[PDB]
Amino acid sequence: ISADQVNQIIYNLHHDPFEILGCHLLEEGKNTKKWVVRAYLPKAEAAWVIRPTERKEDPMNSVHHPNFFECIIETPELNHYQLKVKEGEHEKVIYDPYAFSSPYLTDEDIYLFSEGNHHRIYEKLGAHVGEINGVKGVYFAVWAPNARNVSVIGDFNNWDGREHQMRKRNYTIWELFVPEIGSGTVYKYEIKNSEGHIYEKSDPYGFYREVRPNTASIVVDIDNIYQWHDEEWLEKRRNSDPLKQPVSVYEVHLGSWLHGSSAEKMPLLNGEADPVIVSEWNPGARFLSYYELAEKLIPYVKDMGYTHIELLPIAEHPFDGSWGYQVTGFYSPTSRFGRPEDFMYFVDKCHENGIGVILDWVPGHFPKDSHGLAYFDGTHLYEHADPRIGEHKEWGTLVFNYGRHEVRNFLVANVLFWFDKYHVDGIRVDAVASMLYRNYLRKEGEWIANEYGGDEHIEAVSFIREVNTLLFEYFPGILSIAEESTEWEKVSRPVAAGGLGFNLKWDMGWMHDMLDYFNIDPYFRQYHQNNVTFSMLYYYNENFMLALSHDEIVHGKSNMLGKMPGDEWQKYANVRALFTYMYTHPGKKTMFMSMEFGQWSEWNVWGDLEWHLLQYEPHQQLKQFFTDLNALYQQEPALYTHDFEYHGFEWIDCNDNTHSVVSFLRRSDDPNDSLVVVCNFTPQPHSHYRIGVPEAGYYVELFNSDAKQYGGSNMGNLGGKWADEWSFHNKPYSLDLCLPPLAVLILKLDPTKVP
Numbered sequence: 001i002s003a004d005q006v007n008q009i010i011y012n013l014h015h016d017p018f019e020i021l022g023c024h025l026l027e028e029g030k031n032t033k034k035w036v037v038r039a040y041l042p043k044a045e046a047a048w049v050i051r052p053t054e055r056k057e058d059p060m061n062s063v064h065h066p067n068f069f070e071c072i073i074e075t076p077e078l079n080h081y082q083l084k085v086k087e088g089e090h091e092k093v094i095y096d097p098y099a100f101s102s103p104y105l106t107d108e109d110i111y112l113f114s115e116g117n118h119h120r121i122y123e124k125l126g127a128h129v130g131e132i133n134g135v136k137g138v139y140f141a142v143w144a145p146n147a148r149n150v151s152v153i154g155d156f157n158n159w160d161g162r163e164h165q166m167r168k169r170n171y172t173i174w175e176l177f178v179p180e181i182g183s184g185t186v187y188k189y190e191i192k193n194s195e196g197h198i199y200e201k202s203d204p205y206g207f208y209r210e211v212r213p214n215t216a217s218i219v220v221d222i223d224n225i226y227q228w229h230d231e232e233w234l235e236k237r238r239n240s241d242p243l244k245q246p247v248s249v250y251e252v253h254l255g256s257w258l259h260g261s262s263a264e265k266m267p268l269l270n271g272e273a274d275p276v277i278v279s280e281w282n283p284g285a286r287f288l289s290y291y292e293l294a295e296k297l298i299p300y301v302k303d304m305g306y307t308h309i310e311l312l313p314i315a316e317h318p319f320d321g322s323w324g325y326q327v328t329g330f331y332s333p334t335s336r337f338g339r340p341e342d343f344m345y346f347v348d349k350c351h352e353n354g355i356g357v358i359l360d361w362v363p364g365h366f367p368k369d370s371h372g373l374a375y376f377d378g379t380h381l382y383e384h385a386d387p388r389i390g391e392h393k394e395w396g397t398l399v400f401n402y403g404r405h406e407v408r409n410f411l412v413a414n415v416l417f418w419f420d421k422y423h424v425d426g427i428r429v430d431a432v433a434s435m436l437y438r439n440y441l442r443k444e445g446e447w448i449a450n451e452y453g454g455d456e457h458i459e460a461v462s463f464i465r466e467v468n469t470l471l472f473e474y475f476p477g478i479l480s481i482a483e484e485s486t487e488w489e490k491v492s493r494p495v496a497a498g499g500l501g502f503n504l505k506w507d508m509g510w511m512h513d514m515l516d517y518f519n520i521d522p523y524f525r526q527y528h529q530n531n532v533t534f535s536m537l538y539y540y541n542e543n544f545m546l547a548l549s550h551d552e553i554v555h556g557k558s559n560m561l562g563k564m565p566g567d568e569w570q571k572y573a574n575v576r577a578l579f580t581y582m583y584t585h586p587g588k589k590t591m592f593m594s595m596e597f598g599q600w601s602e603w604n605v606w607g608d609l610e611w612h613l614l615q616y617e618p619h620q621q622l623k624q625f626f627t628d629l630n631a632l633y634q635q636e637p638a639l640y641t642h643d644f645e646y647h648g649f650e651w652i653d654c655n656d657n658t659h660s661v662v663s664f665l666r667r668s669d670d671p672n673d674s675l676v677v678v679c680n681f682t683p684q685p686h687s688h689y690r691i692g693v694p695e696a697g698y699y700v701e702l703f704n705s706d707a708k709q710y711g712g713s714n715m716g717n718l719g720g721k722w723a724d725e726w727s728f729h730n731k732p733y734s735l736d737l738c739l740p741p742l743a744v745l746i747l748k749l750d751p752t753k754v755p
């Protein structure tokens with residue numbers, strides 16, 4: 001490019017910047033092509049073009065002006081790129097604003113979609129505000145290849161679309177522009193299928209929806225509704241390895257954490273809506289908005305010291321009682337709590353406060369509701385046609401046809417959409433086995449094996465691998481967490497190594513072993529020391545997340561206090577010891593709302609939590625306990641830098657099963673950061689209990705779960721204890737400790753203390 005052209009841009013004289021900025025084809029070679037990407041980035045010193053799916057980065061060069069950049073690249077296709085932009089001492093990574101000239105679908109969009117590789121298809125399918133033939137309006141587009149006809153109905157043409165029939169392209173997608181409408185437009189697709197039947201559909205790619213039980217999509221100007229402030233959090237994230245950091249997750253269901261009064265409007269970010277009543281049986285109550293949650297949940301979590309909040313699914317879902325796990329608007333956060341910009345604000349505020357957001361994501365299935373994806377075009381479009389792989393009969397839901405391109409695409413782009421539009425920091429997938437197995441909850445003769453006569457759902461495995469490969473390339477630094485409950489190997493290993501490519505995996509064995517263990521009367525725990533120690537046998541085959549989740553405190557399993565034997569005192573003690581052990585045991589942490597203040601009742605998704613218990617001392621004390629524990633966790637490198645290396649852990653001794661005592665070391669990079677942890681899992685204190693340590697000196701008591709400030713009896717070692725040169729458990733030195741009742745101690749050597 002020339003200097004006159006550059007200057008036209010800099011001084012805003014150019015007639016159409018899309019001719020020059022963006023990605024443009026320079027020439028076609030035999031095997032590859034030459035492209036140029038250009039960007040005008042005022043205030044940027046430097047820039048790069050990222051080709052995330054090829055795993056490449058190329059620098060851009062200033063040309064004629066220091067903020068006008070060009071990059072020339074040779075590669076056959078150049079569909080997927082990002083700009084990395086450096087403004088002084090900060091870097092951001094963004095999609096190229098000048099990537100798409102036109103709001104309508106191109107031949108390139110359609111081709112890519114048909115191959116299943118349009119990672120940004122949501123920019124073109126759905127509904128977008130736009131200009132065509134010189135007129136402001138909305139462009140609508142929708143995949144329905146076997147439909148006979150499709151129209152658009154809504155407020156603007158009183159729900160009759162005779163004059164708004166849509167043009168069908170490449171025998172696959174239906175499109176239409178409508179002038180003079182804008183965001184807020186309420187609408188659906190009127191589809192007539194191959195048999196004359198004329199059903200209505202919510203927009204599969206729609207970005208906002210009416211409040212359940214209504215289901216009309218609403219048009220959002222999604223790139224012009226909210227102003228972010230999280231550049232620095234995003235940079236820190238992209239350049240960090242979250243597996244070597246502390247990660248204590250507070251799991252939350254937004255609809256049932258706290259309610260407000262339905263006798264008032266729900267405040268939003270600079271606005272307000274009509275309240276959404278939580279149910280007809282509790283009509284005095286409403287949900288809080290994303291906005292109100294940003295104001296109440298976030299500082300509450302900040303205070304507790306958790307690093308992350310994980311949300312049960314917020315994609316639009318018709319029925320509260322599904323907990324979110326039956327989704328019908330995969331491209332919108334639920335209107336129960338307000339608008340897309342309100343959730344943006346929620347995520348932005350988390351980031352301002354140093355807190356990550358993880359979303360439960362549900363690509364495994366979708367319900368039969370007729371507003372949604374089922375039998376979409378009058379065929380089995382999204383679901384597999386054959387119910388032996390296309391239906392989950394015990395759930396009454398449909399399974400996505402992962403081998404169908406436009407379906408894979410819908411899902412692969414969907415996961416990316418949450419990281420792109422809403423800046424989230426991780427996803428989790430419930431019930432991964434349900435995707436992995438052709439025989440999932442099906443008995444002999446109602447399932448067909450794969451090609452090679454195995455149980456493996458081959459299209460599913462391959463969708464999962466692609467999803468995770470892509471996520472980490474596009475947004476390095478995120479968490480992709482799985483719960484897979486069948487011993488399937490290499491879940492949290494990279495696709496390269498024959499993994500499924502998640503980076504963390506819930507340890508469900510550890511959860512069963514610990515809750516089974518703590519549920520036994522202390523006296524009999526001697527018969528079950530292996531519950532305590534077994535998880536470390538297979539521990540290194542995966543990167544484990546220690547999760548004690550919402551699933552474990554419903555449907556008659558009790559909340560955590562109620563799982564524990566003994567009187568009130570011993571019940572809180574057992575909670576303290578279990579969670580102290582959890583936070584010291586290798587792996588990342590997840591725990592569910594209500595557990596941190598000792599709720600008695602099971603989680604009830606129709607009400608809110610029992611906040612009034614925080615008026616009382618024991619509940620307050622338990623909450624302080626968790627507050628200090630999270631504070632410690634963040635503060636002590638040995639508790640997070642080496643969760644997943646052998647160096648990070650070693651048992652000191654685990655043979656005293658008679659007193660249900662175990663002890664171990666955690667280590668980090670610096671050996672002065674090493675910690676000694678000792679657990680006493682009965683209410684029998686011990687008085688001169690000897691534990692091998694590996695160096696001499698004063699070991700400070702960093703933490704003692706029996707402290708009276710936490711509800712304990714206050715037995716302890718009075719701040720710490722000098723080692724003895726008295727060999728024990730194969731170690732040169734040893735400590736002669738008080739073990740408080742039902743309690744855990746964390747000690748560290750202070751190698752500069754006065755002998």
Ligand SMILES: OC[C@H]1O[C@H](O[C@H]2[C@H](O)[C@@H](O)[C@@H](O[C@H]3[C@H](O)[C@@H](O)[C@@H](O[C@H]4[C@H](O)[C@@H](O)[C@@H](O)O[C@@H]4CO)O[C@@H]3CO)O[C@@H]2CO)[C@H](O)[C@@H](O)[C@@H]1O
Pocket residue numbers: 567569570683684685713714715741
């Ligand atoms: O200080 C003198 C005593 O110190 C040591 O006692 C220990 C116990 O060995 C531990 O078990 C624990 O006691 C708990 C007890 O387990 C629990 O059930 C509960 O008992 C209460 C009970 O709630 C109440 O209704 C009534 O029975 O009074 C009891 C209070 O003592 O709560 C106890 C904790 O308060 O911790 C204590 C104190 O550190 C030592 O072992 C004893 O020999 C000694 O007498």
Ligand SMILES: OC[C@H]1O[C@H](O[C@H]2[C@H](O)[C@@H](O)[C@@H](O[C@H]3[C@H](O)[C@@H](O)[C@@H](O[C@H]4[C@H](O)[C@@H](O)[C@@H](O)O[C@@H]4CO)O[C@@H]3CO)O[C@@H]2CO)[C@H](O)[C@@H](O)[C@@H]1O
Pocket residue numbers: 653655656657658688689690691
């Ligand atoms: O009565 C007061 C007594 O207090 C002290 O004894 C303690 C020890 O300090 C503790 O460490 C523990 O003993 C455990 C021991 O730690 C554990 O390893 C296991 O020992 C097995 C051993 O592993 C096995 O290889 C073999 O050698 O037999 C050993 C003996 O069982 O189990 C021990 C407990 O059964 O608790 C005791 C108290 O019971 C103090 O040092 C004693 O001298 C004092 O009498």
Ligand SMILES: OC[C@H]1O[C@H](O[C@H]2[C@H](O)[C@@H](O)[C@@H](O[C@H]3[C@H](O)[C@@H](O)[C@@H](O)O[C@@H]3CO)O[C@@H]2CO)[C@H](O)[C@@H](O)[C@@H]1O
Pocket residue numbers: 159188200210214215216
């Ligand atoms: O004030 C009138 C009315 O407004 C609201 O109803 C809207 C619906 O929620 C919305 O879905 C839409 O309804 C259409 C269906 O989705 C569609 O499938 C088809 O059958 O036509 C319907 C419209 O005729 O539009 C209505 C109308 O605005 C609000 O929910 C009502 O309480 C209120 O009565």
Ligand SMILES: OC[C@H]1O[C@H](O[C@H]2[C@H](O)[C@@H](O)[C@@H](O)O[C@@H]2CO)[C@H](O)[C@@H](O)[C@@H]1O
Pocket residue numbers: 145403404405406
């Ligand atoms: O053009 C017919 C048909 O083609 C596409 O389907 C692919 C399918 O996605 C693959 O998994 C594989 O089985 O081959 C098919 C033919 O290429 C579309 O998915 C479909 O809508 C369309 O009508």
Ligand SMILES: [Mg+2]
Pocket residue numbers: 430431
């Ligand atoms: Mg499950």
Ligand SMILES: [Mg+2]
Pocket residue numbers: 607608609610
């Ligand atoms: Mg309540």
